[PDB]
């Protein structure tokens with residue numbers, strides 16, 4: 386209630402996109418904000434409770450690599466308000482812009498992502514949907530992980546088979562983000578058949594082709610990727626070990 390933003394304080398601007406049960410807009414509120422409108426109207430109290438529970442989770446997070454929760458609204462509509470991230474998502478940088486990231490910057494982006502995930506796991510939060518589309522590069526330099534309130538290329542085999550969500554399935558998703566960073570591509574780009582990828586990854590016959598990792602990528606990083614991507618969940622390292630291996634790799 387200390388974080389509820391009264392009706393009329395936020396000027397909603399450009400629509401950015403929709404996804405994750407809502408639509409994100411840029412807005413103004415003591416500067417720039419992002420406003421994620423939920424697809425509800427006259428919330429039933431069951432919905433209003435699920436909403437307050439979601440806000441409860443977000444309020445647990447204060448970390449430089451976690452998208453900054455800033456408030457919520459109930460009027461005129463249910464919405465989550467966060468900082469605005471100056472710049473674009475990691476997905477745009479890797480798969481649209483084709484930015485020439487130095488390998489140095491790639492590993493740093495990997496390091497900051499692991500810090501945020503390590504933090505989330507220390508707060509007992511399983512992300513459940515980590516992907517480069519909802520990792521933002523604020524001012525091109527600081528990772529911000531969003532979309533953990535409440536697709537298949539980041540899903541661990543046990544999640545595809547359908548509770549499979551765990552710290553270790555988060556680790557697998559991070560390994561796919563690593564694959565994006567070190568190849569510049571999404572996994573399974575040769576295949577481009579969603580049902581085939583579900584079938585194959587789910588049964589454990591398909592994993593990302595690590596031969597596409599860029600040649601100037603360090604071998605310790607390639608091995609770390611392979612560990613996060615282990616088909617057996619219990620063979621995946623935790624984020625403290627990932628963070629150690631990264632920060633000691635640089």
Ligand SMILES: CCCS(=O)(=O)Nc1cccc(Nc2ccc3ncn(C)c(=O)c3c2)c1C#N
Nearest residue numbers: 419421452454465467469470519531532533534
């Ligand atoms: C603190 C996480 C709250 S959330 O789980 O509800 N996720 C979000 C809540 C509000 C806005 C979100 N997205 C978001 C947030 C900030 C953003 N800043 C710049 N740009 C270009 C963006 O596309 C952008 C997108 C997100 C995300 N992800």
